[PDB]
Ligand binder design. Structure first.
Ligand SMILES: [Mg+2]
Ligand SMILES: [Mg+2]
Lengths: 123, 126
């Protein structure tokens, strides 16, 4: 399937891509977006099964991305990643049906468990 | 449908019960429990479509109730309520499939939107 990683921080972004690319070992296509605007364009142009996005990104946050996705009912399973332990974000994330809220630094035990649950929810 | 309200404080428990009973108008069945053990017992002995539980309760939290419910073969749709804005509770709730996490003092608007969300999540899974 198609998994879309969104993070304005390139290190964290491309690192999770490599982590997911070797975890998938060719079975899943992993896509990368550097901001929310690009994410929405990939989300409109391609069918994304699992969306993994940061929350705090300039102008368009991950939650803003998810709000525009939830109104359309064909929508990816969403895993949020953030360094911020913010109840408000998590609260909105719940309301919008996010599967997991991973705290940075990313722990790939959690990353992989969440992405498999997201793959399953997509199916 | 059967909606189970769980809160260890009686005033809150009866308050949410009374409001939900008014909105139910007999269409839905409102029952209550005072703690997680009470909830677990009800949850094992009858179908509960919607679970509305406080988190901070003595010995067994609302999140602890949910850990037993996802084991059970069919799950209630779950609304969490709490007076405190706790990220750790919220993050666990997310991982546990919670539909909404409302802050006390509960707002009618938020409460009945979450309940209808739950009602349709349960009707979705029949
Ligand atoms: Mg960021
Ligand atoms: Mg309490």
């Amino acid at each position: 399937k198609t998994i879309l990683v969104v993070d304005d921080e390139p290190r964290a972004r491309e690192g999770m891509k490599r982590l997911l690319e070797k975890w998938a070992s060719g079975k899943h296509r992993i896509i990368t977006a550097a901001n929310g605007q690009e994410a929405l364009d990939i989300l409109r142009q391609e069918r994304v099964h699992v969306l993994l996005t940061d929350i705090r990104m300039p102008e368009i946050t991950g939650l803003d991305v998810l709000e525009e996705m939830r109104e359309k009912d064909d929508s990816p399973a969403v895993i949020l990643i953030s360094a911020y332990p913010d109840f408000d974000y998590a609260q909105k994330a719940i309301s919008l049906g996010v599967l997991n809220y991973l705290l940075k630094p990313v722990k790939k035990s959690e990353l992989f468990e969440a992405v498999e649950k997201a793959i399953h929810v997509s199916e």
